[PDB]
Amino acid sequence: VPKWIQLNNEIMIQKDGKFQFDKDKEAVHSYFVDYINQNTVFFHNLKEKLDYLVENQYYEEEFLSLYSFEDIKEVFKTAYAKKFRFPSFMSAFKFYNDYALKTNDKKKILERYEDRISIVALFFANGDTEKAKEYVNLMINQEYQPSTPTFLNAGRKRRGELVSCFLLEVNDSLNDISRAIDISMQLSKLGGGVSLNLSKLRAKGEAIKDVENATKGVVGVMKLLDNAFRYADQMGQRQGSGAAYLNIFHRDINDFLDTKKISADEDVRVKTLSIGVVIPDKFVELAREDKAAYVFYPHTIYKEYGQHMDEMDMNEMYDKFVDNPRVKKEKINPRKLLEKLAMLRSESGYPYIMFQDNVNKVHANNHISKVKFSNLCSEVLQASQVSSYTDYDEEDEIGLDISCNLGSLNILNVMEHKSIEKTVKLATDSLTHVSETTDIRNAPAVRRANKAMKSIGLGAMNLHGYLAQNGIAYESPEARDFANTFFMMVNFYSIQRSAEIAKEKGETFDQYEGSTYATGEYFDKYVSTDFSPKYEKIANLFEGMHIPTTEDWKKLKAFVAEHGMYHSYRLCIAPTGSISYVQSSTASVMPIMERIEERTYGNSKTYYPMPGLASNNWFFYKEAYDMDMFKVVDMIATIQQHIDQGISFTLFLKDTMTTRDLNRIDLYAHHRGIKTIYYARTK
Amino acid sequence: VPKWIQLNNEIMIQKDGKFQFDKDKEAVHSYFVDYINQNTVFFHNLKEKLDYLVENQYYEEEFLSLYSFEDIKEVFKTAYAKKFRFPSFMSAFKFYNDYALKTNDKKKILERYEDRISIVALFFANGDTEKAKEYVNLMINQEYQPSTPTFLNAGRKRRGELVSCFLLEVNDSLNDISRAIDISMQLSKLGGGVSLNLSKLRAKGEAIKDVENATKGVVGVMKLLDNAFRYADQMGQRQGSGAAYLNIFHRDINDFLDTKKISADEDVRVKTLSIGVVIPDKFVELAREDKAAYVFYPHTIYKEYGQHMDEMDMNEMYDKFVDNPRVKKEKINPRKLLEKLAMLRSESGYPYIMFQDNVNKVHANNHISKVKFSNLCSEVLQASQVSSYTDYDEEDEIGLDISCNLGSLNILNVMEHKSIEKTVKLATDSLTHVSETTDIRNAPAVRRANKAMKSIGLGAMNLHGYLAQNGIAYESPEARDFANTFFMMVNFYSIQRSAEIAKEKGETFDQYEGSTYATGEYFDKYVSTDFSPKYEKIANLFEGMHIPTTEDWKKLKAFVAEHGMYHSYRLCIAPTGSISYVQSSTASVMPIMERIEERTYGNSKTYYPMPGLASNNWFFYKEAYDMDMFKVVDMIATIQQHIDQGISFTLFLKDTMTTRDLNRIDLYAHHRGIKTIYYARTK
Amino acid sequence: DFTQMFYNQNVKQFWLPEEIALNGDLLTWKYLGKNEQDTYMKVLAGLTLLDTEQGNTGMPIVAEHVDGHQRKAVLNFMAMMENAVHAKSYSNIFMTLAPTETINEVFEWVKQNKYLQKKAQMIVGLYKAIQKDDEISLFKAMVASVYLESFLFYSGFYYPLYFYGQGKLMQSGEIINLILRDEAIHGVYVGLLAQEIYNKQTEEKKAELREFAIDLLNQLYENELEYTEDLYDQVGLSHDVKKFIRYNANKALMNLGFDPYFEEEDINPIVLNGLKATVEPLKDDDFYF
Amino acid sequence: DFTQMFYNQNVKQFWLPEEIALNGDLLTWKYLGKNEQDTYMKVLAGLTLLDTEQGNTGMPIVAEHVDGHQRKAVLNFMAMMENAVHAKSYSNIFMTLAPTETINEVFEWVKQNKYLQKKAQMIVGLYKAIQKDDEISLFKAMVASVYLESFLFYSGFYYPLYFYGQGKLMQSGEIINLILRDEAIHGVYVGLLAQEIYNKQTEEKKAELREFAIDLLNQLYENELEYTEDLYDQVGLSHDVKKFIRYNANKALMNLGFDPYFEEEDINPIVLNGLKATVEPLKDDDFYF
Ligand SMILES: Nc1ncnc2c1ncn2[C@@H]1O[C@H](COP(=O)(O)OP(=O)(O)OP(=O)(O)O)[C@@H](O)[C@H]1O
Ligand SMILES: Nc1ncnc2c1ncn2[C@@H]1O[C@H](COP(=O)(O)OP(=O)(O)OP(=O)(O)O)[C@@H](O)[C@H]1O
Ligand SMILES: Cc1cn([C@H]2C[C@H](O)[C@@H](COP(=O)(O)OP(=O)(O)OP(=O)(O)O)O2)c(=O)[nH]c1=O
Ligand SMILES: [Mg+2]
Ligand SMILES: [Mg+2]
Ligand SMILES: [Mn+2]
Ligand SMILES: [Mn+2]
Ligand SMILES: [Mn+2]
Ligand SMILES: [Mn+2]
């Protein structure tokens, strides 16, 4: 057992009835005195290091060639002047095991934290030394964290794509299904998580070229996609991850759900394909009134109306579908379906729940399309247009496939530096740069939507960490007040930066003129409701920072009207799995699952306390499972009212609560305006 | 139970110790006087029938519009003038259950045998009334039988494709793999059996752009193809059938074979994809000498030499592969691999065995490409060039994917009518028409190969029926002499018709100038060796027909040199599974499995005696399992010497014999020049 | 050829009633109508009563007359599952859903019920008729046992599976599914032991044993139809239950190496949702001809 | 007052030999003398025979005659343990340590060994003499069963325990300790059932039953002495084992409610060292907040 691992395991050993949290710090020192410095490759000067990394195909020549060597050296010096120290052993371990650049033999460390941050900053700035230094100060203060793809791969020649969330629309044809399989394989090859909408696909027992009972339904397509994702597994590094979304009014919805049951046969169950269910308000109304619902055959609806079932508003179309004899449908019990969803989420955490009307009643780009499905993490909610992939030697009709750009603000570090505006604007600029530098040659609709929509996702993390280190309970009304104010400022500065980029470049996102930004509707609740903190403690937390008022929001609305907005979507709160360790932050805006988490690496045990955990804030670091899920829903809705896309919202349940409690949480989330529900993790 | 069912079951009820074969005839009468005539749909005249079939989307109106109604009436009258009668109940039952056109609800019979034959003939003639009458006389005499796709689907609006088998070359890339999956689904949707050569795909543990041990090998692609064929299953009517072919020198050859082991795990086992193994002469030489062999990693060979492992001759490059340190290889025991092949064929009948050198030592189009794999029935052996399917928005390099049209001569009916020449020429014309009117819009390499190669497959059926009905034992040297003479005549007249078509159209198949037809090498054994019958009985059997001599072959060689050949490939002997029932013929050139076969249909059981089975020829209808497989190999080699493509050669084994006997049969087949071995069916 | 394989599958399927918490079924149970609750109770009591006969007599009597140490061990294991696991599981389900007085009354009713008694006594009669060293009487009892394990239970299993497939009474439905999975393997195993006896017989004796099996199946089937209408007409399910009985009758016949008796039918989708040649080395000179 | 707690104890003690990996004993086995290996194989073979008959015959027959579904469930479970778990575990040990020929030879040796045949004849004879509704014949068989559980196994158990206590053959020894833990509770349980029957008798009848029990014990004891000498003389341990079997004879008598018969002696201290989620329906009030 290594010395740092012993020093880390000494945390659980209680002295005077208290955990030895400070010992973790010592572990970090050991982890750097015994391992990191010994296995870190050192060079006589930075010029030699850069030459070795470029020549050995570690870095890219293009992004480094935009700067003189003096500017690169100045950026590296700015990164190293902070003298950044990892506060916990797990932060440094996760960085140097997951993100630090290693030799081809994987035994030496080529990149420190400062080196990786400097390289990512130089990639972000695209030739501006001052902008690169600003990015270096942003990331070394740990105010902003690029996502795992961006942070890991920026500036590296041997790399995947910087985007890892991809949403694909699948049209109801064999050509479109095969193209979807191909694109899923190509994007998993790039290292991205792929979500596919299967609602347009006709159900099982439908007609193919006017022969009856011929379609295999969406379950056969799910089997094909599951095989494709198993095959494309990042060159045998990570398990291929894919998601499939189906509307709850699709007839296959039960069989869809049956793919996640343990009792399902081998020809029914898909193991590497996550599933999500899109639930329109009509289904919730039918379940609430206990009226029996109807699941429709999509192809009959398409033949009758010329549009797909998921392309029209089910609230106004459901009665017409039911009363139409030419539309084929099957009787179901919506309450039984809700109970089945709750039971499946209890067993396996699936499916993801998308409340379609909750997403689309605040969607700014409904003119382009309504949000029909979400991503693999159930937080990307954007307009998508299906593509018509025709036969060979025939021109395809390329639509819009969602691929947003991830990046997370560290709420604790951002707010302690009183730099919400600067961090949000710099993160928006970096996300815009990464979106502009993304070029996928095997996903035509993804590339077209990236060029047109210019959608980015700016998330936040360390919400619970910040609240606990400031003596605020996550379920307290003060925490929701802080979340409201902080995320309203984040939205304000994100919109301001998007409008500034649109003014500078002279271009907005495609079909912006039809958006609620152009019409000013988006700013309605912002020009009438003041989002300043209602509690003195939160106001003192925001001291030293200008909180945008209704007049500021009116000025921003006028600015957007005059200049437009560059990004169709700006904010989405991703789970932030492993980057939260490196940043010493709690994951996403979720409450912490455990105060101290026990992990097993190799044959060794390691202990990670939550950041800033001590005896004084032990009570404020309440575990997520012990919390009331209604108050967690309230906080997530408070944040969601300022996020244009969704939030990865995992439910944290105890083994005691039943499926009725899960359904109640889901229905309260639907009532409170929650757009997506990610997971049902049972303790 | 139906009356005809009782009459057919009365065959096995012996009277005076003999089977009541004549009862079978009675059954057909019943089957027509109680079911077919009552279930048939009669019109006032042919005009109303044709109009009803045209407007109700049963028939394509284009092929019928090329004839005036008087000509169509004359063709139908020619078909009905023969007064064709089905001699066995099973012939009529199979036609009216599998090939006769029925209504949309399948409650009535719209097409008689004469109606189907007339429609197929009118489609074949393409506006020529005299040619349509010739086709009608050829098919109503049952001298020639179009394949099941062509016979069933010719002239139908709801038809599929007329091509039975498709062969795809899969290049070593994710884009090519995805395109192969798409094309396999498209062609299975069209109803054709798809064969894919996986020998170019790099083995398991190869590098995908400098990251090693990343590839899943051919087994992952096999699983993808298996799921694709499961999904595309002819709209749920016929199970999707696919074939995978791998060279025996591929490193994955064991894992390949492990896909068919009955103890294979679900993550490896493949159940809807047939497997074939391509064995060069080098492997047989290594096994014979008991020298340990080496299987190779295709990607290392491609990197070192710039060509795929199966793209070059292993007999001359195996030592270079072994001595090359930059080529990666694994040690295997070739005798152990042969024993594994024999055990697998005993257990499940797989893999198909393709003796590559036996195919390519007489292959006429080696300049275009060597034959690297076979079809799903292991009888199509043609040159194929792999396609380079590139990224989206990039032009693809379209290669040649094999596809040929099947058609079988009924040997008994052809020789009874003394019309080898006329039947062969008319069948060649019909297959040329089927190739010309075939246009597949989702398989580009298949379309290009169909347009360029113009390859057709003219098979033969009722070899054993003709031999047994003429008092010739199938294993006798007289039977092999008859096969030699008959198939030399078939080859002569097929080459003559191909050259005549090339002369009349002024065009040959692509790259004909480099073929052995153009250089005259193909005719060598035909201009030096006489293939006239060596037995007086066979010569009497061939009386009334001009058997080509060496002078006729020299004249044909000069004619080909002057005019060329329209078809790259002309003769391939398919299994002819279910259409042999309608023709009252034994399946293909294979010996009969059983004298009387008991088949269960619905809740009833039926007995089909072999065509012409009686007391005097009971022992001439020797069952295949009771026959010496070495003499069957001799027969198949004798036929194969006159067939440019392969023959679907099924091995018929007894349970008592061991895997050593199967290996001996395989090695004798390789020694005798057998190109492919189809199945190892054990009694 | 098969006993060690079945030993493995049996012991790896071992489970205990305590593993499934039953109390959460009360949430769904309270929402069923009187007819649904009545049918469920009656079906449950039917299964309980039949399974007790199998534990006290059926499995132990077969274990007694079968020769072979390994077969006796597998049969003992199966008898244990009936008495120690299944019987306690049925009792647990009852005690959770009904008060003591209601349980006693349902068992009084089902104990007097004509259709339940007819089948219970027919099966028990064949077990009581086994004679020492007479393999014909043993075979007849094995046929009866397979019919119970693979056929007679299924008119009963239908209802818990029907609820289980709808998201109702999930805890007791999970228990029933585990029980059913045990009875399936019991039926297959006893079926193989019966085929062993059958295959030792002459052709005339075989034809006679086939007639016995089909005649017995017919008697039981006609009573099952009456049993089914008696229980399921009040909840409108009898048509679909009848399809499920025939489908399981065919499985029971296949377990005994016999052909299916009934035409293939599709089953209710809710219930569905609930549910070597001798290797001889090449000796060389086999490559030369 | 006791069956439920025995039921719970028996089912919580459930185990399979495959849970214990045996390849760790390979070296300490290899290192034993030929005499030691011979005695060890034969000892376990004698145990295998006893468990074979206890599982096939003894426990099932007692289960048949004892009234009450819970008592029958305990006895059925114990029967399963005998032949499906205990008897089989010995084959796991044999298959690990010994080549097939040595295994074949030791099973041939049990068939021809006169002491092992005599003890089987005596015990199984009493099992097969049980008459329905005759409590005295049942008592006699239960005494025989207690003597098998708590006395007869111990001439065999001595040797694995003797090695375990020296840190030798510890994986095999772990299996044996699990078997011994089971037999101890089996002997107590059957002892309590025997006492029930004994306590129903007149004083005169009781006096005869004590005579039966003591005469049977002495007869079995005298045979076990000869068996012990036959096995252990070649390893020098016969006198030590004899002390152990007398110790356990007293425990068997005590399980039957009788006073100890042999005087206390010091036992080898080595041998002493050898010792789904719950589902509720959705109410209309759960849709409003
Ligand atoms: N907690 C930590 N986080 C990150 N790096 C660390 C940490 N502890 C030590 N290191 C690394 O080890 C070096 C030694 O640091 P130490 O605590 O011994 O003193 P120092 O004054 O920071 O040293 P130096 O002269 O290297 O700057 C640091 O410069 C840094 O590179
Ligand atoms: N074996 C058969 N094959 C094909 N069609 C048959 C067969 N048997 C009967 N039919 C059909 O059923 C009709 C019944 O007539 P059948 O053969 O009994 O003799 P028919 O009335 O004297 O006239 P004909 O033989 O001249 O048609 C036939 O005309 C024919 O259309
Ligand atoms: C992407 C991917 C490829 N492969 C295998 C199958 C293909 O035959 C083979 C080639 O993939 P390619 O698509 O050719 O990958 P590449 O072109 O980026 O890499 P290279 O330059 O080396 O050609 O890699 C996998 O096994 N799994 C995968 O996920
Ligand atoms: Mg379409
Ligand atoms: Mg490539
Ligand atoms: Mn049971
Ligand atoms: Mn049972
Ligand atoms: Mn025991
Ligand atoms: Mn015991």
Contact at 8 Å (CB) between C115 and C231? no
CA angle A598, A599, A605 (to 5 degrees): 90
Rounded to whole angstroms, the Cα distance separating A555 from B131 reads 84
* Beta-bridge partners for A458: A407
Which string of DSSP letters, residue by residue, matches B421-484? HHHHHHHHHHHHHHHHT---SS-HHHHHHHHHH--EEEEEE-HHHHHHHTT--TTSHHHHHHHH
Rounded to whole angstroms, the Cα distance separating D267 from D249 reads 14
Contact at 8 Å (CB) between B404 and B163? yes
Give the technique used to solve this structure.
Answer: cryo-EM
C143 Cα to chain A: minimum distance (Å) = 30
A13 burial level (CB within 10 Å; 0-12, 13-18, 19+): exposed
Take residue D179 and report the two structure tokens written for it. 């078997």
Judged by CB atoms closer than 8 Å, whether chains meet at C278 and B658 is answered as yes
The reply to whether omega before A351 is within 30° of 0 (cis) is yes
Reference A353, options A145, A649, A682, A657; nearest CA is A649
Take residue B536 and report the two structure tokens written for it. 């007086």
State which amino acid sits at residue C216.
L
State which amino acid sits at residue A431.
L
CB atoms within 10 A of CB B104: 13
Contacts of A174 in chain B (CB under 8 A): 185-186, 189, 232
Reference B249, options B327, B324, B330; nearest CA is B330
Q: Alpha carbon of A105 to those of A101, A102, A108, C25: distances in Å?
A: 11, 8, 8, 57
**Residues of C noted as catalytic:** 90
B293 at the C interface (CB within 8 A)? no
The alpha-carbon radius of gyration of chain D (Å, integer) is: 22
Reference C163, options C81, C235, C98, C105; nearest CA is C235
Judged by CB atoms closer than 8 Å, whether chains meet at C281 and B668 is answered as no
Contact at 8 Å (CB) between B139 and B113? no
Ligand nearest to the CA of B87: 2
Contact at 8 Å (CB) between C127 and C55? no
> Measured from the CA of A86, which atom of ligand 1 is nearest?
3
State which amino acid sits at residue D82.
E
Reference A187, options A199, A196, A174, A200; nearest CA is A196
Reference C257, options C218, C209, C221; nearest CA is C209
Of residues C24, C177, C273, nearest to A658 (C-beta): C24
Of residues D279, D283, D288, nearest to A343 (C-beta): D279
Ligand nearest to the CA of B172: 3
Rounded to whole angstroms, the Cα distance separating C219 from C238 reads 19
Take residue A111 and report the two structure tokens written for it. 């990149």
Contact at 8 Å (CB) between A455 and A569? yes
Contact at 8 Å (CB) between D163 and D237? no
A659 at the D interface (CB within 8 A)? yes
Contacts of C277 in chain B (CB under 8 A): 342-343, 346-347, 655, 657-659, 662, 682
Residue nearest to atom 29 of ligand 3 (CA): A232
Q: Alpha carbon of D107 to those of A94, B158, C69, D119: distances in Å?
A: 60, 73, 13, 16
Exposed e or buried b per residue across A113-151, where buried means at least 16 C-beta atoms within 10 angstroms of its C-beta:
bbbbbbbbbbbbbbeebebbbbbbbbbbbbbbbbbbbbb
Rounded to whole angstroms, the Cα distance separating A276 from A664 reads 19
Judged by CB atoms closer than 8 Å, whether chains meet at A335 and D279 is answered as no
> Measured from the CA of A37, which atom of ligand 1 is nearest?
12
Phi, psi of C202 (to 5 degrees): -65, 170
Q: Alpha carbon of D144 to those of A430, A453, D44, D227: distances in Å?
A: 87, 88, 20, 18
Contacts of D285 in chain A (CB under 8 A): none
| Resolution (Å) of this entry | 3.8
The reply to whether omega before B351 is within 30° of 0 (cis) is yes
Using CA coordinates, name the residue in chain C closest to A263.
C275
Of residues A186, A391, A441, nearest to B442 (C-beta): A391
Could you say which residues from 337 to 356 on chain B have a Cβ atom under 8 Å away from some Cβ of chain C? 338-339, 342-343, 346-347
Of residues C74, C83, C167, nearest to D76 (C-beta): C83
State which amino acid sits at residue B373.
F
- CATH second-level architecture of B143-280+334-683? Alpha-Beta Barrel (3.20)
Take residue A158 and report the two structure tokens written for it. 């041997």
Ligand nearest to the CA of A185: 3
Contact at 8 Å (CB) between B483 and B632? no
Touch of D by B (3+ CB pairs closer than 8 Å): no
**A556: Cβ contacts below 8 Å, ≥ 6 apart:** A492, A495, A496, A499, A523, A526, A548
Rounded to whole angstroms, the Cα distance separating A401 from A175 reads 17
How many B×C Cβ pairs under 8 Å? 47
Ligand nearest to the CA of C147: 7
**Residues of B noted as catalytic:** 375, 377, 379
Contact at 8 Å (CB) between A679 and A644? no
The continuous run of DSSP H or E covering B249 comes out as none
Take residue D229 and report the two structure tokens written for it. 């000498």
The three-class DSSP label of residue B278 is: strand
Contact at 8 Å (CB) between A329 and A297? yes
Q: Alpha carbon of B142 to those of A321, B456, B486, B580: distances in Å?
A: 54, 20, 17, 10
- CATH second-level architecture of D1-275? Orthogonal Bundle (1.10)
For ligand 7, the distance from its centroid to the CA atom of residue A567, given in whole angstroms, is 66
D264 Cα to chain C: minimum distance (Å) = 38
Rounded to whole angstroms, the Cα distance separating A280 from A294 reads 13
B658 at the C interface (CB within 8 A)? yes
For ligand 1, the distance from its centroid to the CA atom of residue A79, given in whole angstroms, is 14
Take residue A620 and report the two structure tokens written for it. 């404020």
State which amino acid sits at residue A132.
A
Rounded to whole angstroms, the Cα distance separating A400 from A384 reads 5
Reference B4, options B21, B37, B26; nearest CA is B26
Contact at 8 Å (CB) between A325 and A248? no
> Measured from the CA of B216, which atom of ligand 3 is nearest?
26
User: Among residues A134, A161, A379, A478, which one is catalytic?
Assistant: A379
Contact at 8 Å (CB) between A269 and A223? no
Question: Strands A242-247 and A604-609, how do they pair?
Answer: unpaired
The three-class DSSP label of residue B619 is: coil
Classify the phi-psi angles of D159: left when phi > 0, otherwise alpha if psi is within -120 to 50, otherwise beta: alpha
Of residues B175, B211, B227, nearest to A223 (C-beta): B227
Residues with CB in 5 Å of ion ligand 8: D 51, 82, 86
Best of B31, B32, B35 for a ligand 2 pocket test (most atoms within 8 Å of beta carbon): B32
Gaps in chain A (C to N over 2.5 angstroms) fall after none
Rounded to whole angstroms, the Cα distance separating A620 from A465 reads 9
Place of tokens 């027992």: A205
Which string of DSSP letters, residue by residue, matches chain D? --HHHHHHHHHHT---GGGS--GGGHHHHHTS-HHHHHHHHHHHHHHHHHHHHIIIIIHHHHHHHS-SHHHHHHHHHHHHIIIIIIHHHHHHHHHHHS-HHHHHHHHHHHHH-HHHHHHHHHHHHHHHT--TT-HHHHHHHHHHHHHIIIIITHHHHHHHHHHHTTT-SHHHHHHHHHHHHHHHHHHHHHHHHHHHHHTTS-HHHHHHHHHHHHHHHHHHHHHHHHHHHHHHGGGT-HHHHHHHHHHHHHHHHHHTT----S---PPPHHHHHT------PPPGGGG--
Rounded to whole angstroms, the Cα distance separating A517 from D73 reads 74
Domain boundaries, chain B: 3-142, 143-280+334-683, 281-333
Pocket of ligand 1 (CB under 6 A): A 28-29, 32, 37, 85-86, 92
Judged by CB atoms closer than 8 Å, whether chains meet at D80 and C83 is answered as no
Contacts of C170 in chain A (CB under 8 A): 343
Contacts of D282 in chain A (CB under 8 A): 287, 335, 338-339, 660, 663
The three-class DSSP label of residue B274 is: strand
Catalytic residue check, A377: yes
Instruction: Tell me if D233 is assigned to a ligand binding site.
Output: no
Instruction: Tell me if A369 is assigned to a ligand binding site.
Output: no
For ligand 5, the distance from its centroid to the CA atom of residue B393, given in whole angstroms, is 17
Catalytic residue check, D90: yes
The secondary structure of residue A600, as a DSSP letter, is: E
**C173: Cβ contacts below 8 Å, ≥ 6 apart:** C160, C161, C163, C164, C274
State which amino acid sits at residue D283.
K
Place of tokens 């309980």: C48
